[PDB]
Point group: D3
Chain length 146, copies 6
Amino acid sequence: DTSIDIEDIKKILPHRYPFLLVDKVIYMQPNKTIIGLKQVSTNEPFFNGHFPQKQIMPGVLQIEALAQLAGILCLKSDDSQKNNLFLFAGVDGVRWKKPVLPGDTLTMQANLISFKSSLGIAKLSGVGYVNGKVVINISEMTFALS
Amino acid sequence: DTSIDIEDIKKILPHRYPFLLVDKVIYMQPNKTIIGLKQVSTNEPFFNGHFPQKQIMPGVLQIEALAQLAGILCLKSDDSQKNNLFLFAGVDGVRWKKPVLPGDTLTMQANLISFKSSLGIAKLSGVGYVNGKVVINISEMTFA
Amino acid sequence: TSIDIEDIKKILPHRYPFLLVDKVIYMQPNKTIIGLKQVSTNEPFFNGHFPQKQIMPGVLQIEALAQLAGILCLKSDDSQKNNLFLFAGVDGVRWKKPVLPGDTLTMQANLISFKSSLGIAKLSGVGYVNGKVVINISEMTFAL
Amino acid sequence: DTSIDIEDIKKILPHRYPFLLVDKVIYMQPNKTIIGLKQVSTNEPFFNGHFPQKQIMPGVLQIEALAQLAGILCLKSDDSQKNNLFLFAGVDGVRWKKPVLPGDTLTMQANLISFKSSLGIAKLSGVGYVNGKVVINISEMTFALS
Amino acid sequence: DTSIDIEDIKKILPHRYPFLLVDKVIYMQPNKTIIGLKQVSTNEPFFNGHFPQKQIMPGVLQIEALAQLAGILCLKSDDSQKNNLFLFAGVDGVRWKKPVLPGDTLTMQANLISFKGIAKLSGVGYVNGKVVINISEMTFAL
Amino acid sequence: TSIDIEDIKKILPHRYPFLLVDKVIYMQPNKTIIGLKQVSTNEPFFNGHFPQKQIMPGVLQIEALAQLAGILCLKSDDSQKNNLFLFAGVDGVRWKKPVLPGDTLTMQANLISFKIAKLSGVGYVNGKVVINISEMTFAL
Ligand SMILES: Clc1ccc(OCc2ccccc2)c2ncccc12
Ligand SMILES: Clc1ccc(OCc2ccccc2)c2ncccc12
Ligand SMILES: Clc1ccc(OCc2ccccc2)c2ncccc12
């Protein structure tokens, strides 16, 4: 198996509609890496405003999606700190290569770099794909246990 | 490269948010068959109400998506009738086999049975798949 | 009996924007149920169906009847303390007239069969706007 | 006795979703009176917030509905001022008697009192009903045209 | 005073999205007065309908904001009646002076007149220290 | 030169629920831009971020500053009559303080290079720094 459907995602993360952007976790290795996806449908509430004339997934939400996927890893790698409210502290080295569109499946991988659990400091890298091609690159995502 | 993306789907169907349920058309043969997809995400407005404790894509929206996909075939097979507001006339032989969940891709095939080049009205069959498994069966969708 | 929207939510798990029964105006356990849905412009599906012309999607008329059908099943028999029913099949649906903002949709469902703790219920359904037939359904089948 | 339907109402009023609260106009007399209705359904977006435990139509939106209805009468009594963006200027003597609930029909009547072609100063009274019973009573609505 | 932030507002009022119209209470004196604010942003769900061509905060929603602020005062002034569902009963003498727009900060004050639940309150809203809305009398019901 | 939001929608193509600039208070073409976003509870994202605690998601603060940035670009040079710009990359973002219901978010974007347009961006609540962005990169 090694899979996780949205009901169990909701037990881990606090995020709800309209700001839960991880539909499924397909693979996870604690303290190491996590693979998951987000489905991109026209029937999402952000598309109307971005944009009326042309529907492109906001890249900033692509950041959020990966961050949430990254958040799951930390929470399942270490839950000694029984607090699932993770906040973005800093993000670095983001480059967007290709528009993500309604219809695409967004395949995401996040890799855990450093964890000093006593503080609440987690650093991660992230890559997002569509059809095996790189759409979003993230060098370093910094998250805070508050 | 025979396929239709969101923008051109919106040039064909009048449907908009939150009731446009075709993301992509991946194959189409005029007057014969159409294959498309709808991505199923937690970030869709119906899941909060269906249901709070357990997110299941309402089966009636699976009828809707397949029927919108069917509607594209009718309109691209014959646009002499320059009007894109078709209405569902009836539906028959719907069985739901498996839940459709956030994370799935809904792959849909609609097959044209009859088009009345005399009376007026289209009849089509529909099938929807998740990971190759059959989730929805529709014997006959009726259009006018 | 009558049943208010507060008591309806005590029976059905459906929440916004997918609860499509406003009131149940008559009920007879194991036999028949009469209810209503008020159709207003101020509903979230009307923007997307359609921008140029607001017609209540026929599939939601299926949804509403079947939600009203579900209430009858849960009140006729609740030994199965499960309110999460799912649509299993629907057969013989025919839409006669567009349902519009301003309309009251008066709905009747008639219980045909119930196989106890197998959890199979079969029901017929009709909808009306101004005494006129707008939706007919031969058979709604549920997995209790 | 032209029944007025959703589409033609939208041709009179600039209001759109989720702030158009007239579904139909069933009777109109230019410069005199107007009767219309608003259908009250659970499937409206304001009901989740007002209130989670008990759905009651916000009394203020009942004001807004009569205000839109009255606004239809003004625009169909006199459109020499081809500016359909009318704003609320004052409201006086509003009483609420009964809760307006999902499933109800809100039947609304507005009566024109005064109208000066000089600025957009139109004064109107208004009553709302559910099952013939009075639910909202308004002595005077004052509307300024921009 | 001491502020009542958002989370604590939701513990006093039963109102939720999209009908909670009080963002913050900056000062409150039980049985006397309450001062609060509502941030007016374009990213609010009513602005698309009011209006497509020109975004103006509906006037009746400013009544609702002040009526919710008033509501906080009543419920904290006396919670012997531990029923937070207070309903509008009457409103009298409303006069809107100026359009409230996206970008503005709506500063609001409600003043308790009488309490017997029967509570009467006056209300005033400001944008840039300028009066946008006046309310002589709000009447409310349990 | 001061501004109301009807004109902002004539510049930017973003609409509800993804227009995140309410007012432009100052703009010097090819140089700097000062704007604001009002943070209210009556905003659609707050229900999901989070149920128990309402905090403006940091990524949407990037979105606000970047929309403010894209206004400067479109007014500084509209020879390229395409108002659909797209984020290409963003670098050196640090979040110092939560943005909450009740706050005003005062934003400043400073144009660095234009051939591809680069910009820095800072966000304040009460004159105190909440968000810092070293480099935003755009591709119209
Ligand atoms: Cl000028 C401009 C155009 C379009 C935008 O949408 C967000 C976005 C983000 C990533 C990739 C494409 C688009 C913008 N988002 C933020 C800031 C500016 C923007
Ligand atoms: Cl009794 C009941 C329970 C739940 C429902 O949700 C819609 C649905 C449709 C298809 C499969 C599962 C669920 C219902 N939908 C329509 C009719 C009845 C229903
Ligand atoms: Cl071609 C097409 C056009 C419009 C539609 O709207 C849904 C609907 C359902 C019932 C009556 C009218 C309209 C469709 N609904 C389902 C399937 C196709 C459709």
